[PDB]
Design an enzyme around this catalytic site. Structure first.
Site, PDB file in Angstrom:
ATOM      1  N   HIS A 105     -20.983 -37.614-105.208  1.00  0.00           N
ATOM      2  CA  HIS A 105     -20.745 -36.185-105.181  1.00  0.00           C
ATOM      3  C   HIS A 105     -21.745 -35.365-106.000  1.00  0.00           C
ATOM      4  O   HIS A 105     -21.679 -34.134-105.938  1.00  0.00           O
ATOM      5  CB  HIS A 105     -19.304 -35.896-105.598  1.00  0.00           C
ATOM      6  CG  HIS A 105     -18.285 -36.481-104.673  1.00  0.00           C
ATOM      7  ND1 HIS A 105     -16.938 -36.278-104.841  1.00  0.00           N
ATOM      8  CD2 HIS A 105     -18.415 -37.262-103.573  1.00  0.00           C
ATOM      9  CE1 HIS A 105     -16.285 -36.915-103.885  1.00  0.00           C
ATOM     10  NE2 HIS A 105     -17.156 -37.517-103.097  1.00  0.00           N
ATOM     11  N   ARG A 249     -15.035 -31.460-103.729  1.00  0.00           N
ATOM     12  CA  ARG A 249     -14.130 -32.589-103.511  1.00  0.00           C
ATOM     13  C   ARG A 249     -13.416 -33.046-104.778  1.00  0.00           C
ATOM     14  O   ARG A 249     -12.765 -34.090-104.753  1.00  0.00           O
ATOM     15  CB  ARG A 249     -14.883 -33.755-102.869  1.00  0.00           C
ATOM     16  CG  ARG A 249     -15.444 -33.441-101.512  1.00  0.00           C
ATOM     17  CD  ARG A 249     -16.529 -34.435-101.105  1.00  0.00           C
ATOM     18  NE  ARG A 249     -17.749 -34.214-101.865  1.00  0.00           N
ATOM     19  CZ  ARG A 249     -18.925 -34.773-101.611  1.00  0.00           C
ATOM     20  NH1 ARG A 249     -19.054 -35.663-100.643  1.00  0.00           N
ATOM     21  NH2 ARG A 249     -19.988 -34.437-102.336  1.00  0.00           N
TER      22      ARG A 249
HETATM   23  C1  HEM Z   1     -10.365 -41.700-103.716  1.00  0.00           C
HETATM   24  C2  HEM Z   1     -11.510 -42.249-103.260  1.00  0.00           C
HETATM   25  C3  HEM Z   1     -12.216 -41.816-101.980  1.00  0.00           C
HETATM   26  C4  HEM Z   1     -11.795 -41.013-100.971  1.00  0.00           C
HETATM   27  C5  HEM Z   1     -10.448 -40.310-100.713  1.00  0.00           C
HETATM   28  C6  HEM Z   1     -12.911 -40.872-100.057  1.00  0.00           C
HETATM   29  C7  HEM Z   1     -12.884 -40.150 -98.886  1.00  0.00           C
HETATM   30  C8  HEM Z   1     -13.967 -39.823 -98.107  1.00  0.00           C
HETATM   31  C9  HEM Z   1     -13.963 -39.056 -96.889  1.00  0.00           C
HETATM   32  C10 HEM Z   1     -12.726 -38.445 -96.243  1.00  0.00           C
HETATM   33  C11 HEM Z   1     -15.219 -38.951 -96.450  1.00  0.00           C
HETATM   34  C12 HEM Z   1     -15.676 -38.249 -95.170  1.00  0.00           C
HETATM   35  C13 HEM Z   1     -15.209 -39.055 -93.944  1.00  0.00           C
HETATM   36  C14 HEM Z   1     -15.813 -38.519 -92.672  1.00  0.00           C
HETATM   37  O1  HEM Z   1     -16.948 -38.887 -92.338  1.00  0.00           O
HETATM   38  O2  HEM Z   1     -15.162 -37.680 -91.996  1.00  0.00           O
HETATM   39  C15 HEM Z   1     -16.060 -39.660 -97.376  1.00  0.00           C
HETATM   40  C16 HEM Z   1     -17.437 -39.713 -97.363  1.00  0.00           C
HETATM   41  C17 HEM Z   1     -18.282 -40.247 -98.315  1.00  0.00           C
HETATM   42  N1  HEM Z   1     -17.856 -41.161 -99.259  1.00  0.00           N
HETATM   43 FE1  HEM Z   1     -15.885 -41.808 -99.614  1.00  0.00          FE
HETATM   44  N2  HEM Z   1     -13.991 -41.577-100.550  1.00  0.00           N
HETATM   45  C18 HEM Z   1     -13.595 -42.192-101.721  1.00  0.00           C
HETATM   46  C19 HEM Z   1     -14.392 -43.017-102.470  1.00  0.00           C
HETATM   47  C20 HEM Z   1     -15.747 -43.224-102.356  1.00  0.00           C
HETATM   48  C21 HEM Z   1     -16.570 -44.122-103.137  1.00  0.00           C
HETATM   49  C22 HEM Z   1     -15.985 -45.068-104.204  1.00  0.00           C
HETATM   50  C23 HEM Z   1     -17.863 -43.955-102.746  1.00  0.00           C
HETATM   51  C24 HEM Z   1     -19.145 -44.642-103.206  1.00  0.00           C
HETATM   52  C25 HEM Z   1     -19.258 -45.561-104.168  1.00  0.00           C
HETATM   53  C26 HEM Z   1     -17.866 -42.965-101.673  1.00  0.00           C
HETATM   54  C27 HEM Z   1     -18.978 -42.458-101.013  1.00  0.00           C
HETATM   55  C28 HEM Z   1     -18.975 -41.535 -99.976  1.00  0.00           C
HETATM   56  C29 HEM Z   1     -20.123 -40.802 -99.449  1.00  0.00           C
HETATM   57  C30 HEM Z   1     -21.579 -40.898 -99.898  1.00  0.00           C
HETATM   58  C31 HEM Z   1     -19.695 -40.042 -98.450  1.00  0.00           C
HETATM   59  C32 HEM Z   1     -20.523 -39.033 -97.631  1.00  0.00           C
HETATM   60  C33 HEM Z   1     -20.554 -37.696 -98.422  1.00  0.00           C
HETATM   61  C34 HEM Z   1     -21.273 -36.585 -97.655  1.00  0.00           C
HETATM   62  O3  HEM Z   1     -20.571 -35.689 -97.100  1.00  0.00           O
HETATM   63  O4  HEM Z   1     -22.545 -36.576 -97.568  1.00  0.00           O
HETATM   64  N3  HEM Z   1     -16.572 -42.533-101.472  1.00  0.00           N
HETATM   65  N4  HEM Z   1     -15.262 -40.218 -98.361  1.00  0.00           N
END
Ligand code: HEM
Ligand SMILES: *[C@@H]1O[C@H](CO)[C@@H](O[C@@H]2O[C@H](CO)[C@@H](O[C@@H]3O[C@H](CO[C@H]4O[C@H](CO)[C@@H](O)[C@H](O)[C@@H]4O)[C@@H](O)[C@H](O[C@H]4O[C@H](CO)[C@@H](O)[C@H](O)[C@@H]4O)[C@@H]3O)[C@H](O)[C@H]2NC(C)=O)[C@H](O)[C@H]1NC(C)=O
Ligand SMILES: *[C@@H]1O[C@H](CO)[C@@H](O[C@@H]2O[C@H](CO)[C@@H](O)[C@H](O)[C@H]2NC(C)=O)[C@H](O)[C@H]1NC(C)=O
Ligand SMILES: *[C@@H]1O[C@H](CO)[C@@H](O[C@@H]2O[C@H](CO)[C@@H](O)[C@H](O)[C@H]2NC(C)=O)[C@H](O)[C@H]1NC(C)=O
Ligand code: NAG
Ligand code: NAG
Ligand code: CA
Ligand code: CL
Ligand code: CL
Ligand code: CL
Ligand code: CL
Ligand code: CL
Length: 588
Positions: A105, A249
């Site tokens: 983020h 977020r």
């Molecule tokens: C509580 C932990 C986490 C979530 C709840 C969560 C949720 C999401 C969602 C809903 C998306 C978008 C899904 C879509 O494509 O419609 C999402 C994107 C990204 N994540 Fe997720 N995440 C949780 C946790 C993590 C962890 C531990 C991550 C990495 C170590 C991680 C990464 C990412 C990334 C890079 C994205 C894309 C972000 C963007 O919009 O460019 N997340 N996550």
């Protein structure tokens, strides 16, 4: 997100601090890494029509000679596993998962149109299953374990196109954030937001804090003012809105909120100490100097403590050799593929939020809460004991281990955002649909980009994965390894020694972080950014000490917070950890 925008910006001949938007980091190409611009593409986009339609859009249109697999079918057949068989990681804390999300983020946010904006374009993607722009709903396969009505769907909005209305350019997506590791999740990536996050009532250089609630006398994030605030839908009697932070977020899970709140407090603590040291500094100077320290802390924790435990030592040496110098020819933009590859962290997520009291014991009455009841649940931070119990849970309980038959839990595969949507979402399936929305090449194209063998047959894929059973399941779904979606193939690979990704993700992630470092004029070790005395002082920072300085927690992990995960074995009194010494920030 049109590339010609801002091509003519001139940067000041001299400056002292980063801009909020990232503009002018690179003086020769000032837009590099700046917010609200298109992702860079490391490989050409792959769309069904060569231009913008995602694979899976048109019935009967094949990809690379084989039918497109439903993302939800792949999730059901490959990702689903029985939660009771989850394997805890004996060598990673849950804080390892949470830093990854917080760091993500700082790096990328891909906007999509709001449901509120459906008035402009017909279909509301949250409620309708019609495939009409901007919607790209996920279809339901037969025999689904949860959704028996195949006329239903999992909601999905396509990411906003960069430069809409251009008829000549292949569709790309937008990064709303500064690509640099600059703590933009604290400070914002746009100037109006960044000012609104600041306390402008006085000359203390502070970030604004919640005006309705405190956490045992300590600051909480301010509340945001949103249309259709999802936090209000969690505990509907409490009606606690989402928090306002540098990234939108911050309320998505309370563990993430806790990390944002920690860094807010650390900024204000630093600004307070710097005011005592330098009483003539005005609010702007205090804010910028504290912001500069916080950004350096994020860089240090990330590169010293976190990334070695993601990549493992051989991939660290290959992709992240020792820093030498800033180079203005290095492209510091986030690559489109990274937005999907860095979602490897979804494999680390546990099915509960854990809370531990000041004896590091399960905090009564409810020491664990199912994850599907904490999404957007800002009320839990305000009304169920603040950030200390959550931070203890992150330090003292294990991450989930990614295994080839235990990829990701049903709290995110079946129940994502269940309290705030008409239906629970499937995060692994969303990852796969998103890669198609973004035109990302498949698994073998990325293997080729990384210089790795490209398996063609089931036997070759079994060799690459060291798992013929998994290779057979992937081939049954996808037909060819050329079609495996990048997240799915990436997380299927066996893990590097002492790392938590396989070779393909190690390459993509390591390459991205090398560019973010070598292409950052304000990298904390770049000559002139800090003095040598300041660099020596900053080398003493750690996430456990930041926790000690800004919470009621007095016992914390031993160093490597991301490896330490078992109390009291891995824990020490805060009194044994030296605080950051700001003496070399004094100006006579
Ligand atoms: C509580 C932990 C986490 C979530 C709840 C969560 C949720 C999401 C969602 C809903 C998306 C978008 C899904 C879509 O494509 O419609 C999402 C994107 C990204 N994540 Fe997720 N995440 C949780 C946790 C993590 C962890 C531990 C991550 C990495 C170590 C991680 C990464 C990412 C990334 C890079 C994205 C894309 C972000 C963007 O919009 O460019 N997340 N996550
Ligand atoms: C910009 O920066 C300034 C300076 O840091 C902030 O001012 C502080 O804000 C905090 C947070 O609201 C204030 O905290 C509260 O003080 C109340 C009493 O105030 C009196 O006493 C203090 C001295 O102790 C004086 O400074 C102040 O002017 C008042 O005369 C308490 O009643 C509050 O406790 C209650 O509320 C909290 C929730 O907020 C509950 O958790 C408690 O249980 C209790 O019910 C609270 O402690 C603080 O007083 C302010 N200090 C000063 C010097 O002004 C601004 O808030 C900040 N602005 C923004 C937007 O961030
Ligand atoms: C929504 O939040 C409210 C407010 O905290 C919760 O109600 C409290 O619940 C505890 C435990 O039952 C009681 O001891 C408090 O007296 C309650 N306070 C109030 C004002 O009612 C409620 O449980 C939450 N609801 C949901 C569905 O999570
Ligand atoms: C910044 O990076 C570029 C890219 O590597 C460097 O330019 C290369 O320098 C080597 C060694 O002199 C040459 O063999 C390459 O042909 C160059 N490539 C390009 C694209 O120019 C550049 O030297 C670096 N700058 C500094 C100050 O180290
Ligand atoms: C793109 O095509 C549309 C529809 O054919 C047309 O109205 C519009 O003028 C075109 N845009 C440009 C920049 O030519
Ligand atoms: C931590 O150390 C301080 C200073 O010696 C001591 O007063 C305090 O009781 C210790 N706390 C714990 C939990 O050991
Ligand atoms: Ca950033
Ligand atoms: Cl890309
Ligand atoms: Cl669209
Ligand atoms: Cl507030
Ligand atoms: Cl298996
Ligand atoms: Cl404690």
């Amino acid at each position: 997100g049109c590339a010609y925008q801002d091509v003519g910006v001139t940067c000041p001949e001299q400056d002292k601090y980063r801009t909020i938007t990232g503009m002018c980091n690179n003086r020769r190409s000032p837009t590099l890494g700046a917010s609200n611009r298109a992702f860079v593409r490391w490989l050409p986009a792959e769309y069904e029509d060569g231009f913008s339609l995602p694979y899976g859009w048109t019935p009967g249109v094949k990809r690379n000679g084989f039918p497109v697999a439903l993302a939800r079918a792949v999730s059901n057949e490959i990702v689903r596993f029985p939660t009771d068989q989850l394997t805890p990681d004996q060598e990673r804390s849950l804080m390892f998962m949470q830093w990854g999300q917080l760091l993500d983020h700082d790096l990328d946010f891909t906007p999509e149109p709001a449901a509120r904006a459906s008035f402009v374009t017909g279909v509301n993607c949250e409620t309708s299953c019609v495939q009409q722009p901007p919607c790209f709903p996920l279809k339901i396969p037969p025999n689904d374990p949860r959704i028996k009505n195949q006329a239903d769907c999992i909601p999905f909005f396509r990411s906003c196109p960069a430069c809409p209305g251009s008829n000549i350019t292949i569709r790309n997506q937008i990064n709303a954030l500064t690509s640099f590791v600059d703590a933009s999740m604290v400070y914002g990536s746009e100037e109006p937001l960044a000012r609104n996050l600041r306390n402008m009532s006085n000359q203390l250089g502070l970030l604004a804090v919640n005006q309705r609630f405190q956490d045992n006398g300590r600051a909480l994030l301010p509340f945001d003012n949103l249309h259709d605030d999802p936090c209000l839908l969690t505990n509907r009697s409490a009606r606690i809105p989402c928090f306002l932070a540098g990234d939108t977020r911050s309320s998505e899970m309370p563990e993430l909120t806790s990390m944002h709140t920690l860094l807010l407090r650390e900024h204000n603590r630093l600004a307070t100490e710097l005011k005592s040291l330098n009483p003539r500094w005005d609010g702007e100077r205090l804010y910028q100097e504290a912001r500069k320290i916080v950004g350096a802390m994020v860089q240090i924790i990330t590169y010293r403590d976190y990334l070695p435990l993601v990549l493992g030592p051989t991939a660290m040496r290959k992709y992240l050799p020792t820093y030498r110098s800033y180079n203005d020819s290095v492209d510091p933009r986030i690559a489109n593929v990274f937005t999907n590859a860095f979602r490897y962290g979804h494999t680390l997520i546990q099915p509960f939020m854990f809370r531990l009291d000041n004896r590091y014991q399960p905090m009564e009455p409810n020491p664990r809460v199912p994850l599907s009841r904490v999404f957007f649940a800002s009320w839990r931070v305000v009304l169920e004991g603040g950030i200390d119990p959550i931070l203890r849970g992150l330090m003292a309980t294990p991450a989930k281990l990614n295994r080839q038959n235990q990829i990701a839990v049903d709290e995110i595969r079946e129940r994502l955002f269940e309290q705030v949507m008409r239906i629970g979402l499937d995060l692994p399936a969303l990852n796969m649909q998103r890669s198609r929305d973004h035109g990302l090449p498949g698994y073998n194209a990325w293997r080729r980009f990384c210089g790795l063998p490209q398996p063609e047959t089931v036997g070759q894929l079994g060799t690459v994965l060291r798992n013929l059973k998994l290779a057979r399941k992937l081939m049954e779904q996808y037909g060819t390894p050329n079609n495996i979606d990048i997240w799915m193939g990436g997380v299927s690979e066996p893990l590097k020694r002492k790392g938590r990704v396989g070779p393909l993700l190690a390459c993509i992630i390591g390459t991205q972080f090398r560019k973010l470092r070598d292409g950052d004029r304000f990298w904390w070790e770049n000559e002139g950014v800090f003095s040598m005395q300041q660099r020596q002082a900053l080398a003493q920072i750690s996430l456990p000490r930041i926790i000690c300085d800004n919470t009621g927690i007095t016992t914390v992990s031993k160093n490597n917070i991301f490896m330490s995960n078992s109390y009291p074995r891995d824990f020490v009194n805060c009194s044994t950890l030296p605080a950051l010494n700001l003496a070399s920030w004094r100006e006579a």
